[PDB]
């Protein structure tokens, strides 16, 4: 069947909307990105730390969030010439405003009943809560999807997501999935080029590629934001800005490769998703630093790297409806496998 | 199939838990009441008005609420020697901590995923939100149950709930259910017999029936708190109770007959259904209608609300509408609730 997925991460830049076909395999049919208004971003951020009148405030904020998500769905369906009746369900992550598994709770807003009302499509949402109820951390949820896509009996694979930070799913045959953070991804390269050039990121890693790595600075870094970095830059002589960028690229490449090889030395394939997959200069370094592995974008395996996360939530909607587990308890720490999410039906037919 | 219903109203005394059998009819198999600890009641009251750190406070409070609910569920099933496997679903209202349809939101807590984890039973919850999302008030929900129980496009009926106060669901041939308030119910009779003899209520209305309606007072009252009664009484004990009974009987019957003069049957639920003397006067004052307890239709008057929520779980799973749009103001009929499956472990 066909499923929509909606993901809005913690950076609050915007919402990913995806349409998948799910059968034997998972395939991306269409995708759509919608920016988040400054006002909505600011209002969500203010809910991410304790404050006054949170119940009412969250209620007003989630209504705007859902309206935006619904518009995003509408536009994708218009582009695809698809009726909402052709979509089995939307898997919506919602928007995390508090995550405290040590206190046994996780809070994602995004009024799924309202989302069902506005879209006319069944909504599956609230995926993390059952994992936390079963004693897990409620995160990360993507490794179960990584396993469904890429796990097999025969190959040691690492599925590497390079966003602001880097995280990996280790798919070792005959074993359960493992997952951990590898280190920084794009976070410092973004911050540096912003501080220096006003750009939000370094396109294709071209700026970095134009500079030369400074090995002294690199050693200091290996031994994450700007105040931290500035404290480092003061300890070294003035460097050209591009050399700093080149050095920051190498930091991520080395931190990732070192963490990956330490945990899975026999790794045969590293499959890279997230926006970092588009940083050509970074992909180049990762491949040089892991010469015994094939390092490639997930695009080469039929999953476009920018849309992996959104696709996971579409997939989680499918898992719910099929009553199959959606978590990976070895990674989340839950007592065992659980069906994740809650169903808010459109019910258009009355 | 069999369904559990879970209700915890805003008085916060305890949880009503019922077990129904649903087929062609709705029948009560068992019921259980679980008092709420003072500490939990206090913390919920504190979340019913705006205050600090609400997200985290509500999260931790609802964990306790759910643990209690799960205990109530396990206890009822134990009492019946019944495996949770025999139950299709729990319909859980949750606990209302904020309700503001004017700002298009309603908030019931009660972490249904945790409820499913602890009970091992599918949970349907969060019933009010889709009605609100469709432009309705999100309340009251019980008239949809009244309509399903007693509605048909051919007889004029009223379902009268007598609690502290009185409300009625009008079932008119063909029409969606409508509803309204009809003034006081048990509130004054309870207030007065408490103040006068320390009793919580007037059992069977026998105190009121031992007295005579003083017609002066009745006319005054007809022209609601304990000191409000005492204002009236000075300008003039069992006669008083009798006159309070008549007050409710007259105001209720007059409201009902204005709205549907054609009423053929008045079905009474709530604890007032047990007030034999009140029921007698209501029957005298609506002589064209048969006045009877819902118990005469297999629906125990004290357990309507719990039963309504087990029924709403059934309606969700049957893919049938759950709201009463002519009551709530919603755009039309909607499936109410969200499903949190127990699944496998
Ligand atoms: N063409 C490109 N070249 C280099 N980096 C790119 C890029 N496109 C995206 N990125 C990087 O990806 C980051 C965002 O990727 P990410 O996977 O984290 O997206 P997200 O915010 O949806 C979660 C950007 O901040 C940028 O550093
Ligand atoms: N046997 C009886 N005789 C008379 N009145 C009775 C009664 N049993 C219950 N009641 C009345 O019903 C009231 C409780 O009914 P109600 O429907 O309001 O309960 P609740 O759980 O909603 C609060 C009692 O206070 C009393 O007035
Ligand atoms: C509570 C929450 O929203 N966690 C997110 C967050 O954003 C990234 C990281 O922290 C990850 O643990 C998780 O999301 C990804 C998509 C995941 O669940 O795998
Ligand atoms: C928002 C909310 O919890 N409403 C309750 C409340 O308690 C009584 C009254 O206000 C009624 O409107 C409703 O419950 C009843 C059972 C209902 O929904 O029919």
Curated annotation (Swiss-Prot), chain B:
Q: Tell me what reaction this enzyme catalyses.
A: 1,6-anhydro-N-acetyl-beta-muramate + ATP + H2O = N-acetyl-D-muramate 6-phosphate + ADP + H(+)
Please give the knockout or disruption phenotype noted for this protein.
Cells lacking this gene accumulate anhMurNAc. Deletion of this gene increases fosfomycin sensitivity. Growth rate is not affected.
Q: Which residues does the record give as ATP binding sites?
A: 9-16
- Cited SUPFAM superfamilies: Actin-like ATPase domain
Give an example GO biological process: response to antibiotic
Per the UniProt record, which EC number(s) apply here? 2.7.1.170
Record's keyword terms, sorted: Antibiotic resistance, ATP-binding, Carbohydrate metabolism, Kinase, Nucleotide-binding, Transferase
Which one Pfam family would you cite for this protein? AnmK
Write down the top EC class of this protein.
transferase
The record's Gene3D superfamilies line, in alphabetical order, gives: 3.30.420.40
Q: NCBIfam families, alphabetically?
A: PRK09585.1-3
* Task performed by this protein: Catalyzes the specific phosphorylation of 1,6-anhydro-N-acetylmuramic acid (anhMurNAc) with the simultaneous cleavage of the 1,6-anhydro ring, generating MurNAc-6-P. Is required for the utilization of anhMurNAc either imported from the medium or derived from its own cell wall murein, and thus plays a role in cell wall recycling. Contributes to intrinsic fosfomycin resistance in P.aeruginosa.
Q: Which family does it belong to?
A: Belongs to the anhydro-N-acetylmuramic acid kinase family.
Q: Quote the protein name from its UniProt record.
A: Anhydro-N-acetylmuramic acid kinase
Natural source organism: Pseudomonas aeruginosa (strain ATCC 15692 / DSM 22644 / CIP 104116 / JCM 14847 / LMG 12228 / 1C / PRS 101 / PAO1)
């Amino acid at each position: 069947p066909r499923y929509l997925g909606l993901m809005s991460g913690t950076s609050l830049d915007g919402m990913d909307i995806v349409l998948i076909e799910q059968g034997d395999r998972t395939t991306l049919l269409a995708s759509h990105y919608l920016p988040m208004p400054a006002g909505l971003r600011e209002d969500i951020l203010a809910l991410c730390v304790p404050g006054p009148d949170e119940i009412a405030r969250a209620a007003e904020v989630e209504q705007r969030w859902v309206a935006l998500a619904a518009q995003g769905v509408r536009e994708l369906l218009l582009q695809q010439q698809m009726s909402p009746d052709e979509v089995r369900a939307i898997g919506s992550h919602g928007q995390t405003i508090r995550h405290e598994p040590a206190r046994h709770f996780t809070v994602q807003i995004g009024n799924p009943a309202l989302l069902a009302e506005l879209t006319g499509i069944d909504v599956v949402a609230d995926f993390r809560r059952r994992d936390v109820a079963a004693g897990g951390q409620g995160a990360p949820l993507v490794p179960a999807f990584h396993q469904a896509l890429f796990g097999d009996d025969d190959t040691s694979r690492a599925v590497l997501n390079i966003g602001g930070f880097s995280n990996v799913s280790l798919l070792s045959p005959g074993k359960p999935v493992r997952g951990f953070d590898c280190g920084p991804g794009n976070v410092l390269m973004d911050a540096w080029i912003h501080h220096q050039r006003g750009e939000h990121f370094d396109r294709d890693g071209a700026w970095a590629a134009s500079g030369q790595v400074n090995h002294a600075l690199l050693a200091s870094l290996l031994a994450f934001n700007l105040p931290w970095l500035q404290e480092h830059l003061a300890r070294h002589p003035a460097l050209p800005a591009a050399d700093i960028q080149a050095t920051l690229l190498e930091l991520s490449a080395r931190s990732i490769s070192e963490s990956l090889l330490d945990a899975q030395p026999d790794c045969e394939e590293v499959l890279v998703c997230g926006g970092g997959a588009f940083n050509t200069a970074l992909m180049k370094r990762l491949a040089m630093l892991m010469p015994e592995a094939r390092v490639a974008s997930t695009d080469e395996y039929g999953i476009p790297p920018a849309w992996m996360e959104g696709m996971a939530f579409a997939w989680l909607a499918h898992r719910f409806l099929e009553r199959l587990p959606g978590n990976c308890p070895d990674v989340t720490g839950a007592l065992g496998p659980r069906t994740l999410g809650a169903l808010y039906p459109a019910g258009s037919h009355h």
